[PDB]
PDB file of C-alpha atoms in Angstrom:
ATOM      1  CA  UNK A   1      99.761 103.744 132.523  1.00 57.62           C
ATOM      2  CA  UNK A   2      97.649 104.473 129.422  1.00 54.40           C
ATOM      3  CA  UNK A   3      96.506 102.929 126.248  1.00 56.24           C
ATOM      4  CA  UNK A   4      98.050 104.896 123.577  1.00 54.47           C
ATOM      5  CA  UNK A   5      98.233 105.490 119.730  1.00 53.49           C
ATOM      6  CA  UNK A   6      99.374 107.840 117.046  1.00 53.17           C
ATOM      7  CA  UNK A   7      96.767 108.842 114.539  1.00 53.95           C
ATOM      8  CA  UNK A   8      95.896 111.387 111.814  1.00 54.05           C
ATOM      9  CA  UNK A   9      92.761 113.373 112.049  1.00 57.14           C
ATOM     10  CA  UNK A  10      90.200 114.550 109.514  1.00 56.76           C
ATOM     11  CA  UNK A  11      88.916 118.298 109.112  1.00 59.53           C
ATOM     12  CA  UNK A  12      85.408 118.849 110.532  1.00 59.48           C
ATOM     13  CA  UNK A  13      84.140 119.455 107.001  1.00 59.08           C
ATOM     14  CA  UNK A  14      85.357 116.073 105.693  1.00 59.81           C
ATOM     15  CA  UNK A  15      83.996 114.461 108.962  1.00 63.26           C
ATOM     16  CA  UNK A  16      80.736 115.908 108.502  1.00 64.41           C
ATOM     17  CA  UNK A  17      80.518 114.534 104.863  1.00 67.56           C
ATOM     18  CA  UNK A  18      81.516 111.170 105.975  1.00 68.70           C
ATOM     19  CA  UNK A  19      78.767 110.625 108.464  1.00 68.03           C
ATOM     20  CA  UNK A  20      76.152 111.933 106.134  1.00 67.71           C
ATOM     21  CA  UNK A  21      77.295 109.638 103.503  1.00 65.43           C
ATOM     22  CA  UNK A  22      77.366 106.696 106.352  1.00 64.28           C
ATOM     23  CA  UNK A  23      73.645 107.430 107.211  1.00 63.05           C
ATOM     24  CA  UNK A  24      72.724 107.506 103.564  1.00 64.48           C
ATOM     25  CA  UNK A  25      74.116 104.231 102.665  1.00 63.23           C
ATOM     26  CA  UNK A  26      74.013 102.020 105.977  1.00 66.89           C
ATOM     27  CA  UNK A  27      70.924 101.301 107.827  1.00 67.31           C
ATOM     28  CA  UNK A  28      71.177 101.238 111.687  1.00 71.51           C
ATOM     29  CA  UNK A  29      71.389  97.313 111.322  1.00 71.31           C
ATOM     30  CA  UNK A  30      74.663  97.469 109.320  1.00 68.63           C
ATOM     31  CA  UNK A  31      76.523  98.148 112.293  1.00 67.83           C
ATOM     32  CA  UNK A  32      77.480 100.543 115.194  1.00 67.72           C
ATOM     33  CA  UNK A  33      78.410 104.073 113.946  1.00 69.45           C
ATOM     34  CA  UNK A  34      81.721 105.518 115.198  1.00 69.64           C
ATOM     35  CA  UNK A  35      81.028 109.070 116.623  1.00 66.73           C
ATOM     36  CA  UNK A  36      82.049 111.711 114.210  1.00 68.19           C
ATOM     37  CA  UNK A  37      84.657 113.306 116.387  1.00 68.32           C
ATOM     38  CA  UNK A  38      86.111 109.885 116.844  1.00 68.91           C
ATOM     39  CA  UNK A  39      86.866 109.347 113.209  1.00 65.38           C
ATOM     40  CA  UNK A  40      90.603 108.995 112.661  1.00 69.00           C
ATOM     41  CA  UNK A  41      93.223 107.128 110.867  1.00 69.83           C
ATOM     42  CA  UNK A  42      95.543 105.293 113.203  1.00 71.25           C
ATOM     43  CA  UNK A  43      99.235 105.233 112.516  1.00 71.28           C
ATOM     44  CA  UNK A  44     100.591 103.111 115.284  1.00 75.74           C
ATOM     45  CA  UNK A  45      98.861 101.430 118.106  1.00 77.47           C
ATOM     46  CA  UNK A  46     101.071 101.350 121.210  1.00 79.30           C
ATOM     47  CA  UNK A  47      98.861  99.360 123.738  1.00 76.18           C
ATOM     48  CA  UNK A  48      99.447 100.119 127.419  1.00 77.26           C
ATOM     49  CA  UNK A  49     102.336 102.389 127.893  1.00 77.46           C
ATOM     50  CA  UNK A  50     104.086 103.519 131.073  1.00 78.31           C
ATOM     51  CA  UNK A  51     104.712 107.135 131.768  1.00 78.13           C
ATOM     52  CA  UNK A  52     108.391 106.614 131.095  1.00 80.67           C
ATOM     53  CA  UNK A  53     107.923 104.610 127.933  1.00 80.87           C
ATOM     54  CA  UNK A  54     105.425 107.421 126.815  1.00 80.52           C
ATOM     55  CA  UNK A  55     108.101 110.085 127.406  1.00 78.06           C
ATOM     56  CA  UNK A  56     110.720 108.095 125.355  1.00 77.86           C
ATOM     57  CA  UNK A  57     108.413 107.222 122.471  1.00 80.29           C
ATOM     58  CA  UNK A  58     107.198 111.050 122.401  1.00 80.19           C
ATOM     59  CA  UNK A  59     110.952 112.056 122.224  1.00 82.14           C
ATOM     60  CA  UNK A  60     111.402 109.653 119.144  1.00 83.48           C
ATOM     61  CA  UNK A  61     108.416 110.957 117.550  1.00 86.37           C
ATOM     62  CA  UNK A  62     109.740 114.401 117.819  1.00 87.19           C
ATOM     63  CA  UNK A  63     112.771 113.252 115.539  1.00 88.11           C
ATOM     64  CA  UNK A  64     110.278 112.820 112.583  1.00 84.46           C
ATOM     65  CA  UNK A  65     110.969 115.245 109.894  1.00 83.92           C
ATOM     66  CA  UNK A  66     108.098 114.477 107.333  1.00 83.65           C
ATOM     67  CA  UNK A  67     106.733 116.616 104.629  1.00 83.68           C
ATOM     68  CA  UNK A  68     103.153 117.480 104.757  1.00 78.85           C
ATOM     69  CA  UNK A  69     101.026 115.312 102.214  1.00 81.05           C
ATOM     70  CA  UNK A  70      97.604 115.239 100.763  1.00 83.00           C
ATOM     71  CA  UNK A  71      95.122 112.448 101.542  1.00 84.58           C
ATOM     72  CA  UNK A  72      92.429 111.518  99.260  1.00 83.04           C
ATOM     73  CA  UNK A  73      89.755 108.986 100.292  1.00 83.65           C
ATOM     74  CA  UNK A  74      88.969 106.849  97.185  1.00 84.18           C
ATOM     75  CA  UNK A  75      88.081 103.621  98.630  1.00 83.38           C
ATOM     76  CA  UNK A  76      85.840 101.688 101.027  1.00 83.23           C
ATOM     77  CA  UNK A  77      85.340  98.356 102.141  1.00 86.74           C
ATOM     78  CA  UNK A  78      84.552  95.914 104.932  1.00 84.70           C
ATOM     79  CA  UNK A  79      86.602  93.282 106.948  1.00 83.49           C
ATOM     80  CA  UNK A  80      84.348  90.824 108.411  1.00 81.93           C
ATOM     81  CA  UNK A  81      86.811  89.125 110.678  1.00 82.05           C
ATOM     82  CA  UNK A  82      87.158  92.173 112.899  1.00 79.69           C
ATOM     83  CA  UNK A  83      83.610  93.233 111.816  1.00 80.16           C
ATOM     84  CA  UNK A  84      84.349  96.843 110.630  1.00 78.67           C
ATOM     85  CA  UNK A  85      83.508  98.914 107.750  1.00 82.42           C
ATOM     86  CA  UNK A  86      86.093 101.540 106.764  1.00 84.92           C
ATOM     87  CA  UNK A  87      87.361 104.234 104.412  1.00 85.33           C
ATOM     88  CA  UNK A  88      90.640 104.060 102.745  1.00 83.23           C
ATOM     89  CA  UNK A  89      92.820 104.690  99.658  1.00 82.57           C
ATOM     90  CA  UNK A  90      93.716 102.511  96.947  1.00 84.13           C
ATOM     91  CA  UNK A  91      97.137 103.872  96.708  1.00 86.14           C
ATOM     92  CA  UNK A  92      98.059 105.567  99.970  1.00 89.32           C
ATOM     93  CA  UNK A  93     100.383 108.549  99.717  1.00 87.30           C
ATOM     94  CA  UNK A  94     104.214 107.668 100.205  1.00 83.24           C
ATOM     95  CA  UNK A  95     104.430 110.167 103.006  1.00 86.61           C
ATOM     96  CA  UNK A  96     101.707 108.435 104.874  1.00 84.70           C
ATOM     97  CA  UNK A  97     103.416 105.056 104.675  1.00 82.46           C
ATOM     98  CA  UNK A  98     106.661 106.525 105.529  1.00 81.48           C
ATOM     99  CA  UNK A  99     105.342 108.143 108.725  1.00 78.92           C
ATOM    100  CA  UNK A 100     103.529 105.160 109.811  1.00 79.30           C
ATOM    101  CA  UNK A 101     106.453 103.057 109.121  1.00 77.55           C
ATOM    102  CA  UNK A 102     108.689 105.269 111.101  1.00 77.30           C
ATOM    103  CA  UNK A 103     106.271 105.446 114.191  1.00 77.76           C
ATOM    104  CA  UNK A 104     105.858 101.490 114.154  1.00 76.03           C
ATOM    105  CA  UNK A 105     109.484 100.940 113.929  1.00 78.12           C
ATOM    106  CA  UNK A 106     110.141 103.256 116.903  1.00 77.67           C
ATOM    107  CA  UNK A 107     107.401 101.557 118.717  1.00 78.59           C
ATOM    108  CA  UNK A 108     108.927  98.221 117.965  1.00 79.43           C
ATOM    109  CA  UNK A 109     112.226  99.071 119.028  1.00 77.72           C
ATOM    110  CA  UNK A 110     110.751 100.221 122.233  1.00 83.04           C
ATOM    111  CA  UNK A 111     108.846  96.940 122.880  1.00 83.07           C
ATOM    112  CA  UNK A 112     105.522  97.801 121.751  1.00 82.17           C
ATOM    113  CA  UNK A 113     104.329  94.623 119.917  1.00 85.35           C
ATOM    114  CA  UNK A 114     103.394  95.190 116.078  1.00 87.92           C
ATOM    115  CA  UNK A 115     103.204  92.434 113.492  1.00 84.69           C
ATOM    116  CA  UNK A 116     101.657  95.156 108.059  1.00 84.93           C
ATOM    117  CA  UNK A 117     100.192  98.698 107.882  1.00 88.58           C
ATOM    118  CA  UNK A 118      96.737  98.990 106.137  1.00 90.49           C
ATOM    119  CA  UNK A 119      95.689 102.560 106.682  1.00 90.47           C
ATOM    120  CA  UNK A 120      91.961 102.904 107.152  1.00 91.04           C
ATOM    121  CA  UNK A 121      89.391 105.075 108.838  1.00 92.39           C
ATOM    122  CA  UNK A 122      86.731 102.859 110.494  1.00 96.49           C
ATOM    123  CA  UNK A 123      83.320 104.096 110.399  1.00 97.43           C
ATOM    124  CA  UNK A 124      81.074 101.173 111.752  1.00 97.96           C
ATOM    125  CA  UNK A 125      81.965  98.707 114.411  1.00 99.14           C
ATOM    126  CA  UNK A 126      80.348  95.305 115.078  1.00 99.15           C
ATOM    127  CA  UNK A 127      79.457  95.107 111.390  1.00101.28           C
ATOM    128  CA  UNK A 128      78.754  91.290 111.448  1.00100.21           C
ATOM    129  CA  UNK A 129      76.913  91.107 108.169  1.00101.96           C
ATOM    130  CA  UNK A 130      78.249  91.781 104.636  1.00100.33           C
ATOM    131  CA  UNK A 131      76.864  95.010 103.302  1.00 95.39           C
ATOM    132  CA  UNK A 132      76.825  96.694  99.929  1.00 96.80           C
ATOM    133  CA  UNK A 133      79.890  99.112  99.805  1.00 94.43           C
ATOM    134  CA  UNK A 134      79.379 102.164  97.692  1.00 98.77           C
ATOM    135  CA  UNK A 135      82.285 104.363  96.629  1.00 98.41           C
ATOM    136  CA  UNK A 136      83.058 107.189  99.011  1.00101.60           C
ATOM    137  CA  UNK A 137      81.675 110.622  98.375  1.00 99.43           C
ATOM    138  CA  UNK A 138      83.145 112.991  95.920  1.00 99.77           C
ATOM    139  CA  UNK A 139      86.429 115.050  96.843  1.00101.78           C
ATOM    140  CA  UNK A 140      87.301 113.639 100.336  1.00 99.27           C
ATOM    141  CA  UNK A 141      90.571 115.203  99.979  1.00101.11           C
ATOM    142  CA  UNK A 142      92.719 117.370 102.419  1.00101.11           C
ATOM    143  CA  UNK A 143      96.195 118.158 103.479  1.00100.57           C
ATOM    144  CA  UNK A 144      97.654 116.385 106.392  1.00100.00           C
ATOM    145  CA  UNK A 145      99.409 118.998 108.675  1.00 98.14           C
ATOM    146  CA  UNK A 146     100.364 117.073 111.653  1.00 94.06           C
ATOM    147  CA  UNK A 147     100.013 113.888 113.677  1.00 94.67           C
ATOM    148  CA  UNK A 148      98.763 113.142 117.253  1.00 95.49           C
ATOM    149  CA  UNK A 149      99.324 110.933 120.248  1.00 94.63           C
ATOM    150  CA  UNK A 150      96.181 110.019 121.728  1.00 93.29           C
ATOM    151  CA  UNK A 151      95.341 108.069 125.045  1.00 93.74           C
ATOM    152  CA  UNK A 152      92.217 105.912 124.701  1.00 93.83           C
ATOM    153  CA  UNK A 153      89.973 105.239 127.653  1.00 97.62           C
ATOM    154  CA  UNK A 154      86.769 103.314 127.958  1.00 96.45           C
ATOM    155  CA  UNK A 155      83.660 104.573 130.103  1.00 98.88           C
ATOM    156  CA  UNK A 156      80.939 103.868 130.140  1.00102.53           C
ATOM    157  CA  UNK A 157      80.305 101.651 127.107  1.00104.04           C
ATOM    158  CA  UNK A 158      82.126 104.372 125.143  1.00100.23           C
ATOM    159  CA  UNK A 159      85.469 104.944 123.815  1.00100.72           C
ATOM    160  CA  UNK A 160      86.874 108.300 124.512  1.00 97.95           C
ATOM    161  CA  UNK A 161      90.107 109.520 122.892  1.00 96.66           C
ATOM    162  CA  UNK A 162      92.205 112.373 124.594  1.00 99.96           C
ATOM    163  CA  UNK A 163      95.013 114.135 122.465  1.00102.56           C
ATOM    164  CA  UNK A 164      98.124 114.092 124.199  1.00103.12           C
ATOM    165  CA  UNK A 165     100.798 115.636 121.983  1.00102.67           C
ATOM    166  CA  UNK A 166     100.902 117.109 118.493  1.00103.04           C
ATOM    167  CA  UNK A 167     103.843 117.227 116.023  1.00103.40           C
ATOM    168  CA  UNK A 168     103.836 119.318 112.837  1.00105.66           C
ATOM    169  CA  UNK A 169     104.663 117.896 109.440  1.00105.66           C
ATOM    170  CA  UNK A 170     107.216 120.122 107.408  1.00105.41           C
ATOM    171  CA  UNK A 171     106.184 122.119 104.408  1.00104.75           C
TER     172      UNK A 171
END
């Protein structure tokens, strides 16, 4: 029984620019930085999932026939209630919203509690103070080619993400 979620990943090049930007614009006291390799955009969080339910949800995810799409990170902000600082998009691509909505619907149909989708990439956690939010860096834009089912585990004091399955988008 594992804590699962579907997510979209970032090319190493973009991840590197994001952490250089983050270091440049937020002092250590602004919050706890998410490790560069852990940067991602969650599509659907499934919570704890049995091996049997995982197999079923995976089969459903394999039904998805979604065209590849381009993701351009033009927005950033802070949500004080969950105490995170994130990167996002002013107008998320239709393909992203469609993919997330399908996976959340599949999850909901399968008894994995959901809720509205606000796609974002969390850069800092435990950000309890309002900080100045600069625009993101220039040209953080890339083709999304697939999505991935991850298992999340926590030890020790650290969150670890293990990829379980990937599904290509069409093109």
